[PDB]
Write a protein that binds this ligand. Structure first.
Ligand code: BCL
Ligand code: BCL
Ligand code: BCL
Ligand code: BCL
Ligand code: BCL
Ligand code: BCL
Ligand code: BCL
Ligand code: CLA
Ligand SMILES: CCCCCCCCCCCCCCCC(=O)OC[C@@H](CO[C@H]1O[C@@H](CO)[C@H](O)[C@@H](O)[C@@H]1O)OC(=O)CCCCCCCCCCCCCCC
Ligand SMILES: CCCCCCCCCCCCCCCC(=O)OC[C@@H](CO[C@H]1O[C@@H](CO)[C@H](O)[C@@H](O)[C@@H]1O)OC(=O)CCCCCCCCCCCCCCC
Ligand code: SF4
Ligand SMILES: [Ca+2]
Lengths: 121, 20, 654, 359, 122, 121
C-alpha cells in the first residue's frame, strides 16, 4: 500500500476521465444551452468518479474501524457520532438552505387558509 | 423409538439415492 | 468455548461490573440530553434576532405536539408569538446541553471507578453510601442497597423523587398548577404528585422487605437485564397502543389535530423548479424561466397540513416507533435470557434452581405440550384468518363464478368488542385475528429459545447438544441441521415478526386488510364501501396499497431516494442468507489469487490482499440486519407519505 | 490501560482477655496469574482442636484439593504440635500426597528449635512494638514413607545412588526443594536456607511393605523479615485454644483472573499493646513480600472495603489510615488513604496500618 | 472473467446511479451534469432506432449480466470435482448435489455444481 | 385413516359451519339487497371450506403421486395431462363463456375503426 499501488489508482482515474472526455468529441451529441463542449464530459466523469471513490473509502473505512474498536471507544465513538450529526444540521441551515421558505416580497405563509388564498390568487 | 425415528430421516438423506 | 472477541460483543454484561453498568447508563443519558437539545434547536421556526428559522424535519415533528402541550412551543401564526417560542427552545436546548455535560462527567468517572470530587476532597464508596446525605440516612437507615433485590426500594424511591421533580418543574417553570381534571395538561402535574406518593410508599415497602422473587436473577447481570428487557418491550408496546387512542382524543385536539391547519416545509420535499437555461442574478431573473414565480429559485414549496393529514401521520410515526422497538426488545429479552439459560445448562446450575420461573419448565414433557399449544393455536388461527382474506379476495375479483355478496362482509367483531373500534367492519375482525396469529407465529421462535437453548426433544434423540448460542449448524448430517441455535431462532422471530409488524403499519395507515385487493378498478373491488356500509373509505387493499401510497413517494425526490436505498439494502441480505457461504469462500480465493496474479504481472512488486468472507453465523447476523433494516427503512415511507384514509365511502360503480 | 481489583474484609473481636477474632475475606481480580500453567484452582482447610490444657498439645489438620492444568493434586496432613520450651516445639503427624493416579503416604517425628541472635533489655524497654527480630530455625525430620509403588522404590534407589556418587548433595538439594520461582522467593524475604544434613537413609521393614526412612535435619535464618522466626510465640496460640479454631479458604485462577474466598476464626487476632489498649495483630510481612513478587505485573485500580466489628463498650483510640465511616459498634474502611495502602501492600509494600481499641 | 465482470458492472451501475442522482437533484446536481451525452458510438448506431444513453447502458448491462452469470458457469466447467481452495483444504467434491460440508472452515455451503447452477439461474 | 379419523374431519367441518352460521346472528349485520340472512354465512362458509379442502387434497395428491411415478407412467401420465387441458379448454367455451362476445343485437366488432365508431354510437 505505497508507491505504485496508489500511483495505479490515480493513473486509472486520469485514464478513465480522458477516455470519457475523448469519446465525446466523436460521440456527436448536441450540447445543453450555455454549456462548454469540454466541460460537459469533465463534469459527468467527476460525478461518476466520486460515487465509486466515496463507496470504496466507506467500505475500507468501516472495515478499518470494525476490527479496531474496543472498550476505549466507549466515550469517543458516541461523541464523534454526535459531532457529525451536529455539523450536519448546521450544514442544512448554512450551506444546503439559508432560512425558512419566504416570498419575493419577504412575507411568510404558515397557515392552510393563508396558503389556500395564495393558491386561488 | 429413537431407532424407528432415525430410519425415517435416513429415508430422506443428503447421500446418493433415486429421486422421482 | 466459542469465541466472544467480536467487535459487537465488546460491551457485553460479562465484560462489565455493576459500577460500570451505572457508568454506561449515565454516559448515554448525557448523550441523550445532547440529542434532545438538537431536536429543540432544529424546531426554531424564526430566530430570536429575526433571521428565518429551520425547515420542518421529522425529528422535531414527533415532539412538536408535546412542546406545544407544555408551552415551550406554540402553534401561533404570528411571528411576534413565534419569535419568543424560538428563544425558549434555545433556553431548553442550552439547558439540556449543561445537564447532559454533567451526566457525561458523572458517567466517565463512574465508568473509570474514579468517584472523587475536588471541592470535597473525599472519594465516595459504591458498596455503601448515605444517599444525598441526611435525606437517605432518615429513609435507608444510613445504608445503601447491597443487591439487585435490595436496590428495588432505593430504585423505587429515586423514581418517586424524579416524579416529584417533574411536578415541581411544571408548576414553577411551566406554570401548570395541579388541577385534578383529566381534560387539561394541568392533570399531568396532579398525577405527577400522586405517582410520587405511590412510588415513595412503594419504595419504602421494598427497602424494609427486599423481594425474594426470581432469587437467581441476583446472581447474574444478564439474567436480570433480560427479564427487564422482556418487561420494557411490553411496556413500550403498551405506550404505542395508548398513544394511538389518546393522541386523537378530543382533549388532545389542541396539540395533534391542530397540525392539519398548518403549512409545513419539510426538507427534501418538492421545491420551486427552474428551466435548463436559467441564469439567476442578484436583483432579478434574466433570460430564464422559473416555475411558480411566487418563491425564490430552489425554494421548498408549501404543503397543506389538512391534505397531508399530519395529525395522523405524526400519531403513526410515534405509535409505530414505540411498537417496532417494543417487539424488538421482547425478542432481545428472550434472546439475551436464553443466552443466560445456555450457561446455566452448560455449567449445570439449572436442575438446582427452585424458582418456578425455571422450575415450571424443567421437564421436556411439559415443554412439548406448551410448544404444541402455541403451535396448534397458531395453525388454527393463521389459517382461519388467511382463508377469510383469500376468500374475500376471490369473491370480489369474481374468480370461480363468485361475487362480493358471497364474501365475508357480514363478519365483523361481536357487539361486546365494538367499543374497541370507532367504525366496526371485517377490516377489524381480521386485524385482531391477524395480530393474534402474528403473535403466536413469532412466539414459536421464542418458546424455542426459552426451552431448547441447549438440548431439544430431537437433539436428545439424535444424541447432540447445542454447545453455543451462535453456531450455524451441525453440517449436512441427518439431512441437515441449519438454523438450530437460539441466535438463529432469534432471527426467525424477527423475520416472522415482520408480518404482524406490517399488519400494524397497514392498519394504522387506514388500509383494508380483509382483502388482498380493495379499491382496484375490477369487478367488485370498489363495491366494498356499500356492501358493508363502511363509514370510511380505506386508502387501498393489501396489494393495491403499494400502488396508491407510492404516488406521493415518487413525487418526492427524497422519499424516493429512501425507496431506492431501502430496496438496495434489503435484497443484499439474500447474498448472506442463501446457502452460498461455501461458494463465497471459494470465489474470494480466486479473487485473491487473480488480484495477486494481476499485481505480479503488472507491477514488479507483488502485493496480495487475501479477500475475506463472512461466516454463516456472521452471515445470518448481517442478513437479518439487512433484511429488517431494509424492510422498515421503507415502512417509514408508508407512514410519512401522508394519511389518505377519508370519512366518505364510495357508491357501487354498477 | 488499568485493571481493577474488588475485595471485602471483616474482623469481629470479643471482649475481656479473649484474643478470638472472626476474619472473612472475598477478592476478585481481572489480570492473568503468573502461574505458567492455567487453569489452576485450589481449596485449603485448616482445623485445630485442643487435646488437653495442661500438656498444651493441639491436633492440626490440613487438606489441599487443587486441580492444576486438569491434574488433580491433593496433599493431606494430620499432626500433633505442642510447646516443649520457649525455643523448642515438637510435632508428631501423618499425611498423604496424591497426584493424578499416583499417591504416597508419610509419617513424621519432628522438632523445631528457634533462637534469637541477641536478647537485650534495652530493645525491649525502648521499643513498644518491635517488628524485626533476628533469628534462626532448626528442623529435626524423621520421614517414614512406605515404598508401595514401583516409582517410589526407583525415587529412593535413585536418591541413595545420588548421595553415594555426588559429594554436593546437601547443596544441590536446595535447587530441587525450591522448584521454579520459590527459590527466588528465598532471597526476596531475606531468608537463607542452610544445607540439609542427612543423619540416615535406612530401609526398615513395615507390616505392609518395605519403608524407606529418612532422618534429616536442616536450618534456616531470617534477617528479621521472616515471621516464623521473628514471631515464633504468636503463630501458635495453643493455650488460648479454649474452643476448636478453623480457617477455610479457596481460589480459582485462569487466563481471566483470580477469584479468592477466605473465612475462619482463631485466636491471636488481638494482642495487648500497652497502657490498657488492645490492637489488631501486626500484618505478616512474608505474605506481602511474597505477593509483591506476582502483584507487580498489571496496573490495577483497587475497590476494597474493610468492615471491622468491635466488642460492646470498645471503641478505637487511634487508627491510621483513618476509618472512612463509623456505624455504631462497627467501623468501616474504604477509599482515599486505605485504598492507597491496599495498592501499597498488594504490590509488596509492608507499610504499617495500626488500630488501637480500648474499653 | 471476474475482472471483466467487475470493471463492467461497476462502470455501468455507477452511470445509472449517477443519472438517477442528477435527475432527482440530489447533492445540488442538475440533469445537465448527467450522462445524457453518452450514447453508442457512430459505428454501432445502426444497431438501434433513435440511439441514446438507454442504448449504451443496455449493451453494457447485458455484457455485465453475461459475465456475471458466466462466473457460475466457468466454475461448473472447472471445479466439478476439485477447486484451488479445496485442493488447498484437502477436500474432494464427490458429488454434484451435495449441500455443504457442514459448519467447518467458517462453513462451505453452495459449493456443488448443482448449487453453482442455481447461482447462474439466480 | 378409517372410522373416526374421517368422522373428525367431517364432524369438525360441520360444527365449524354452525359457528359462522351462529356468529352471523350474533353479528346482526345489515344484509346485501335481495339476499337471505340465513344464506349469506352458508355461502361464505362453503367457499372458505372448499378453499381449505382443495389445498389439503392438492398437497396430499402430489405427495401420493410424487413418489409413485415410475417407468410404467411413461405413457399414462402424459396422456392424462392432455386430458386435464383438453376437458379444461372445452369447459372454457362451454361453461365459463358461451361464444365470442357479440352485441345485444348480435353484431361483431373486430376492427379499431369499428371500436372507434361503435363507441361513439
Ligand atoms: C438486534 C436484535 C437483538 C439483539 C441481539 C444481540 C446480538 C446478536 C448480540 C447482542 C449482544 C449484546 N447485547 Mg443484545 N440485542 C438486542 C437488544 C439489546 C439492547 C437494547 C437496546 O434493549 C441492549 C442494551 C442489549 C445488550 C447487549 C449486550 C449485553 C451485548 C453487547 C453489546 C455490544 O457490544 O454491542 C456492540 C457495541 C457497540 C458500540 C455497537 C452499537 C450497539 C448499539 C449501542 C446497540 C446495542 C444493542 C445491539 C443489538 C448490540 C449488537 C449489535 C450487533 C451488530 C448485533 N441488546 C435485540 C433484542 N445482542 C452480544 C452478546 O454478547 O450477546 C450475548 C451479541 O452477540
Ligand atoms: C514456612 C516457613 C518455614 C516453616 C515454618 C515452621 C513453623 C512455624 C513450625 C514448623 C514446624 C515444623 N516444620 Mg517447618 N517450615 C518450613 C519448612 C519445612 C519443611 C520443608 C518442606 O522444607 C518441612 C518438612 C518442615 C517440617 C516441619 C514439621 C516437623 C513441624 C510441623 C509441621 C506441620 O505440622 O505442618 C502442618 C501442615 C501444614 C500444611 C500447615 C501449613 C500452615 C501454614 C504455613 C500457615 C497456616 C496458618 C494460618 C496463617 C493461620 C491459621 C490458624 C488456624 C487455627 C490453623 N518444615 C519453612 C522453612 N515449621 C513446627 C514445629 O515447631 O514443630 C515442632 C512449627 O511450629
Ligand atoms: C429502557 C431501559 C433498558 C435498557 C436500555 C439500554 C440501552 C438502549 C443500552 C443499554 C446499555 C447497556 N445496558 Mg441497559 N437497559 C435496561 C436495563 C439494564 C440491566 C438490568 C439488569 O435490568 C443491565 C445489567 C443493563 C446493562 C447495560 C449494558 C449491557 C450496557 C452499558 C454499556 C454502555 O453504556 O457503554 N441494562 C433496560 C432493559 N441499556 C447500552 C449499550 O451499550 O448496549 C450495548 C445501550 O445502548
Ligand atoms: C435524562 C437525560 C437528559 C434528558 C432527556 C430528555 C428526553 C429523552 C426527553 C426529555 C424531555 C423533556 N425534558 Mg429533558 N433531559 C434531561 C434533563 C432535564 C431536566 C433536568 C432536571 O435537568 C429538565 C427540567 C428537563 C425537561 C424536559 C421537558 C422540557 C421535557 C418533558 C419532560 C417530561 O415529560 O418529563 C416527565 C418525566 C417524568 C414524569 C419522570 C418520570 C419518568 C418515569 C421514571 C418513566 C416511567 C415510564 C415507563 C412507564 C417506565 C415503567 C417502568 C417502571 C414501572 C417505572 N430535562 C437530561 C439532560 N428530556 C422530553 C421531550 O422533549 O419530549 C418531547 C423527552 O422525551
Ligand atoms: C445525575 C447524577 C448521577 C451520578 C453522577 C455523578 C457525579 C456528577 C458525581 C458522581 C460521583 C459519585 N457517585 Mg455517582 N451518579 C449517580 C448515581 C450514583 C449512585 C446511585 C446508585 O444512586 C451512587 C451510590 C453513586 C456514588 C457516587 C458517590 C459515592 C461519588 C461521590 C463524590 C462526589 O462528588 O459525591 C457527591 C455525592 C455523594 C457523596 C453521594 C450521595 C449523593 C448522590 C447519590 C449523588 C449523585 C447525584 C444525585 C443522585 C442527583 C439528583 C437526583 C435527583 C432525583 C435529581 N452515584 C447519579 C444518578 N456521580 C462523583 C464523581 O465521580 O466524582 C469524580 C461526582 O461528582
Ligand atoms: C365463528 C368463530 C371464529 C371466530 C370469530 C370471532 C368473533 C365473531 C369475534 C372473535 C374475537 C376474538 N377472536 Mg376469533 N374466531 C375464531 C377463532 C379464533 C382463534 C383460534 C385460532 O382458534 C383465536 C385465537 C381467536 C382470537 C380472538 C380474539 C382476538 C377475540 C376473543 C373473543 C372471541 O373470540 O369471542 C367470540 C368467540 C366465539 C363466539 C367462539 C370461539 C371459538 C374458539 C376460538 C374455537 C374456534 C377455533 C377453530 C377450531 C379454528 C379452526 C381451525 C381448523 C382446525 C382449521 N379467534 C373462529 C374462526 N372471533 C372477537 C373480536 O374482538 O374480534 C375482532 C369477536 O368479536
Ligand atoms: C469511455 C469508455 C467506456 C465505454 C464506452 C463505450 C462506448 C462509447 C461504446 C461502447 C461499446 C461497447 N462496450 Mg463499453 N465502455 C467502457 C468499458 C467496457 C467494458 C469493460 C468492463 O471494460 C466492456 C466489456 C465493454 C463492452 C462494450 C461492448 C458492448 C461494445 C464494444 C465496442 C467498444 O467498446 O467500442 C469503443 C471502445 C472504446 C472507445 C474504448 C474501450 C476501452 C476498454 C474496453 C476498457 C476501458 C477502460 C476500463 C473500463 C477501465 C475501468 C476500470 C474500473 C475503474 C475498475 N465496455 C468504458 C467504461 N462502450 C459500444 C456500443 O455499442 O455501445 C452501445 C460503444 O459505442
Ligand atoms: C448488488 C448486489 C450484489 C453484488 C454487487 C454482488 C457481488 C458479488 N457477488 Mg453476489 N449475490 C447477490 C448480490 C450481489 N452480489 C445476491 C442477492 C445473492 C444471492 C443469490 C448473491 C450470491 C452470491 C454467491 C453465491 C456468490 C456471489 C459472489 C459475488 C462476487 C463475484 C462477482 C465478482 O467478482 O464481481 C462482480 C462485479 C462486481 C461486484 C462489481 C461491483 C458492482 C457494484 C458497483 C458493487 C457496489 C454496490 C453496492 C451495492 C454498494 C452498497 C451500498 C450500501 C448502501 C448497501 C461479487 C463481489 C461470488 C463470490 O466470489 O463471492 C465472493 C459467489 O460465490 N454472489
Ligand atoms: C410482531 C409479532 C406479533 C405482532 C403483534 C405486535 C404488534 C401489536 C401492536 C398492537 C397494534 C395496535 C396499533 C395501534 C392500536 C390501535 O389501532 O388501536 C385502535 C383500534 C382500532 O382503531 C381504529 O383503527 C382504524 C385503522 O384502520 C380503523 O379504521 C378504525 O375502525 C378503528 O377503530 O385497534 C384495536 O382495537 C386493536 C386491534 C387488535 C386487537 C387485539 C387483539 C389481541 C388480543 C388477544 C390476544 C393476542 C395475543 C396472543 C398471544 C401472543
Ligand atoms: C443470463 C444473462 C443474460 C440474459 C440473456 C441475454 C440475451 C439477450 C442478448 C441481448 C439482446 C437483446 C434481445 C432483444 C433484441 C433487441 O432488442 O434488438 C434490438 C436492439 C435495439 O432495438 C430497439 O430497442 C428499443 C427498446 O427500447 C429501443 O428503444 C430502440 O432505440 C432500439 O433500436 O437491441 C440491441 O441492439 C441489443 C442491445 C445489446 C447489445 C449487445 C452487446 C453484447 C455484445 C458483446 C459481448 C457480450 C457478451 C459477453 C460475454 C458473455
Ligand atoms: S449450507 Fe450452511 S446451514 Fe446449510 S448445512 Fe451447510 S453450513 Fe449448515
Ligand atoms: Ca399512506
Amino acid at each position: 500500500s505505497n508507491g505504485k499501488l496508489i500511483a495505479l489508482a490515480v493513473g486509472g482515474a486520469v485514464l478513465m476521465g480522458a477516455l470519457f472526455f475523448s469519446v465525446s468529441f466523436l460521440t456527436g451529441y448536441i450540447p445543453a444551452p450555455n454549456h462548454s463542449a469540454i466541460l460537459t464530459p469533465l463534469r459527468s466523469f467527476m460525478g461518476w468518479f466520486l460515487l465509486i471513490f466515496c463507496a470504496s473509502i466507506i467500505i475500507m473505512g468501516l472495515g478499518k474501524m470494525s476490527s479496531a474498536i474496543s472498550d476505549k471507544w466507549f466515550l469517543s465513538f458516541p461523541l464523534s457520532i454526535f459531532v457529525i450529526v451536529m455539523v450536519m444540521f448546521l450544514s442544512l441551515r448554512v450551506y444546503w438552505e439559508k432560512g425558512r421558505t419566504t416570498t419575493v416580497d419577504g412575507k411568510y405563509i404558515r397557515t392552510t387558509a393563508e396558503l389556500k388564498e395564495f393558491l386561488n390568487k | 423409538d429413537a431407532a424407528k425415528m432415525r430410519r425415517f430421516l435416513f429415508q430422506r438423506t443428503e447421500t446418493r439415492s433415486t429421486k422421482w | 468455548e466459542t469465541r466472544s472477541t467480536k467487535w459487537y460483543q465488546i460491551f457485553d454484561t460479562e465484560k462489565l461490573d455493576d459500577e460500570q453498568v451505572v457508568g454506561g447508563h449515565l454516559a448515554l443519558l448525557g448523550v441523550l440530553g445532547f440529542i434532545m437539545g438538537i431536536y429543540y434547536i432544529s424546531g426554531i421556526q424564526v430566530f430570536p434576532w429575526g433571521a428565518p428559522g429551520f425547515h420542518d424535519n421529522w425529528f422535531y415533528l414527533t415532539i412538536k405536539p408535546r412542546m406545544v402541550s407544555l408551552g415551550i412551543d406554540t402553534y401561533s401564526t404570528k411571528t411576534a408569538d413565534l419569535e419568543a417560542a424560538g428563544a425558549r427552545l434555545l433556553g431548553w436546548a442550552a439547558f439540556h446541553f449543561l445537564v447532559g455535560s454533567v451526566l457525561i462527567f458523572g458517567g466517565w468517572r463512574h465508568w473509570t471507578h474514579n468517584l472523587t470530587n475536588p471541592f470535597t476532597g473525599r472519594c465516595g464508596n459504591f458498596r455503601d453510601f448515605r444517599f444525598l446525605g441526611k435525606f437517605g440516612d432518615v429513609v435507608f437507615n444510613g445504608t445503601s442497597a447491597k443487591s439487585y433485590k435490595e436496590a428495588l426500594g432505593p430504585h423505587a424511591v429515586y423514581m418517586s423523587l424524579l416524579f416529584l421533580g417533574w411536578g415541581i418543574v411544571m408548576w414553577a417553570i411551566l406554570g401548570f398548577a395541579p388541577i385534578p381534571d383529566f381534560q387539561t395538561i394541568n392533570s399531568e402535574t396532579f398525577m405527577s404528585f400522586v405517582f410520587a406518593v405511590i412510588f415513595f410508599a412503594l419504595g419504602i415497602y421494598w427497602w424494609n422487605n427486599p423481594p425474594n422473587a426470581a432469587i437467581h436473577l441476583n446472581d447474574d447481570m444478564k439474567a436480570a437485564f433480560s427479564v427487564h428487557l422482556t418487561a420494557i418491550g411490553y411496556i413500550n408496546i403498551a405506550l404505542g397502543c395508548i398513544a394511538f387512542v389518546a393522541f386523537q382524543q378530543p382533549s388532545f385536539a389542541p396539540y395533534y389535530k391542530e397540525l392539519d391547519k398548518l403549512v409545513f416545509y419539510l426538507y427534501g420535499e418538492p421545491f420551486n423548479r427552474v428551466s435548463f437555461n436559467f441564469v439567476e442574478q442578484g436583483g432579478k431573473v434574466i433570460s430564464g424561466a422559473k416555475e411558480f414565480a411566487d418563491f425564490p429559485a430552489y425554494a421548498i414549496l408549501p404543503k397543506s397540513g389538512e391534505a397531508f393529514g399530519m395529525a395522523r401521520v405524526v400519531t403513526n410515526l410515534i405509535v409505530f416507533n414505540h411498537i417496532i422497538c417494543g417487539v424488538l426488545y421482547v425478542f432481545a429479552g428472550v434472546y439475551h435470557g436464553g443466552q443466560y439459560l445456555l450457561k446455566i445448562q452448560l455449567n449445570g446450575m439449572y436442575n438446582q434452581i427452585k424458582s418456578i420461573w425455571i422450575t415450571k419448565g424443567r421437564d421436556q414433557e411439559v415443554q412439548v405440550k406448551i410448544l404444541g399449544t402455541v403451535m396448534a393455536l397458531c395453525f388454527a388461527t393463521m389459517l382461519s384468518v388467511y382463508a377469510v382474506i383469500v376468500w374475500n379476495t376471490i369473491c370480489e375479483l369474481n374468480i370461480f363464478g363468485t361475487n362480493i355478496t358471497m364474501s365475508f362482509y357480514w363478519l365483523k367483531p361481536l357487539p361486546i368488542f365494538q367499543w374497541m373500534f370507532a367504525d366496526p367492519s371485517i377490516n377489524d375482525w381480521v386485524m385482531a385475528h391477524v395480530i393474534t396469529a402474528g403473535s403466536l407465529f413469532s412466539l414459536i421462535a421464542l418458546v424455542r429459545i426459552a426451552f431448547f437453548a441447549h438440548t431439544s426433544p430431537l437433539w436428545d434423540d439424535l444424541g447432540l447438544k447445542k454447545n453455543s448460542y451462535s453456531f450455524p449448524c451441525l453440517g449436512p448430517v441427518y439431512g441437515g441441521t441449519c438454523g438450530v441455535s437460539i441466535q438463529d431462532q432469534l432471527w426467525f422471530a424477527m423475520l416472522w415478526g415482520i408480518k404482524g409488524l406490517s399488519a400494524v403499519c397497514w392498519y394504522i395507515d387506514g388500509a383494508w386488510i380483509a382483502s388482498m385487493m380493495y379499491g382496484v378498478p375490477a369487478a367488485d373491488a370498489k363495491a366494498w364501501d356499500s356492501i358493508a356500509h363502511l363509514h370510511h373509505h380505506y386508502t387501498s387493499g393489501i396489494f393495491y396499497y403499494f400502488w396508491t401510497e407510492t404516488v406521493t413517494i415518487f413525487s418526492s425526490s427524497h422519499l424516493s431516494t429512501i425507496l431506492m436505498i431501502g430496496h438496495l439494502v434489503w435484497f443484499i441480505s439474500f447474498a448472506v442468507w442463501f446457502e452460498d457461504r461455501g461458494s463465497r469462500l471459494e470465489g474470494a480465493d480466486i479473487q485473491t489469487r487473480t488480484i495477486r496474479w494481476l499485481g505480479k504481472k503488472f507491477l514488479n512488486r507483488d502485493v496480495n490482499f487475501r479477500f475475506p468472507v463472512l461466516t454463516i453465523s456472521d452471515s445470518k447476523l448481517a442478513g437479518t440486519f439487512l433484511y429488517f433494516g431494509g424492510t422498515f427503512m421503507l415502512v417509514f415511507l408508508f407512514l410519512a407519505n401522508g394519511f389518505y384514509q377519508t370519512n366518505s365511502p364510495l357508491p357501487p360503480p354498477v | 490501560d488499568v485493571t481493577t481489583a474488588h475485595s471485602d474484609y471483616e474482623i469481629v473481636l470479643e471482649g475481656g482477655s479473649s484474643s478470638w477474632g472472626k476474619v472473612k475475606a472475598r477478592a476478585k481480580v481481572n489480570a492473568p496469574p503468573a502461574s505458567p500453567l492455567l487453569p489452576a484452582d485450589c481449596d485449603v482447610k485448616l482445623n485445630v482442636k485442643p487435646l488437653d490444657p495442661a500438656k498444651g498439645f493441639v491436633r492440626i489438620s490440613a487438606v489441599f484439593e487443587s486441580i492444576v492444568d486438569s491434574t488433580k493434586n491433593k496433599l493431606t496432613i494430620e499432626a500433633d504440635i505442642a510447646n516443649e520450651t520457649k525455643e523448642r516445639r515438637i510435632s508428631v503427624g501423618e499425611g498423604m500426597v496424591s497426584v493424578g493416579d499416583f499417591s504416597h503416604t508419610f509419617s513424621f517425628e519432628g522438632s523445631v528449635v528457634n533462637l534469637f541472635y541477641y536478647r537485650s533489655d534495652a530493645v525491649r524497654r525502648n521499643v513498644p512494638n518491635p517488628i524485626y527480630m533476628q533469628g534462626r530455625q532448626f528442623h529435626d525430620i524423621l520421614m517414614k514413607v512406605p515404598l508401595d509403588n514401583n516409582d517410589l522404590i526407583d525415587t529412593w534407589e535413585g536418591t541413595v545412588k545420588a548421595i553415594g556418587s555426588t559429594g554436593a548433595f546437601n547443596d544441590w538439594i536446595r535447587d530441587f526443594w525450591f522448584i521454579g520461582p520459590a527459590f527466588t522467593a528465598l532471597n526476596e524475604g531475606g531468608q537463607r536456607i542452610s544445607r540439609i544434613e542427612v543423619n540416615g537413609l535406612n530401609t526398615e521393614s513395615g507390616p505392609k511393605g518395605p519403608v524407606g526412612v529418612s532422618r534429616w535435619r536442616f536450618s534456616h535464618g531470617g534477617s528479621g523479615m521472616v515471621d516464623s522466626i521473628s514471631r515464633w510465640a504468636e503463630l501458635f496460640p495453643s493455650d488460648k485454644l479454649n474452643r476448636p479454631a478453623q480457617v477455610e479458604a479457596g481460589f480459582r485462577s485462569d487466563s481471566q483472573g483470580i477469584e479468592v474466598k477466605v473465612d475462619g476464626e482463631f485466636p491471636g487476632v488481638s494482642v495487648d499493646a500497652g497502657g490498657g489498649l488492645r490492637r489488631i495483630l501486626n500484618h505478616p510481612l512474608i505474605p506481602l513480600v511474597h505477593h509483591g513478587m506476582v502483584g507487580k505485573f498489571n496496573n490495577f485500580n483497587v475497590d476494597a472495603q474493610l468492615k471491622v466489628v468491635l466488642p460492646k463498650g470498645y471503641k478505637i483510640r487511634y487508627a491510621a489510615p483513618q476509618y472512612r465511616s463509623q456505624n455504631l459498634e462497627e467501623y468501616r474502611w474504604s477509599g482515599g488513604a486505605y485504598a492507597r495502602w491496599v495498592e501499597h501492600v498488594c504490590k509488596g509494600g509492608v507499610g504499617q496500618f495500626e488500630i488501637l481499641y480500648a474499653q
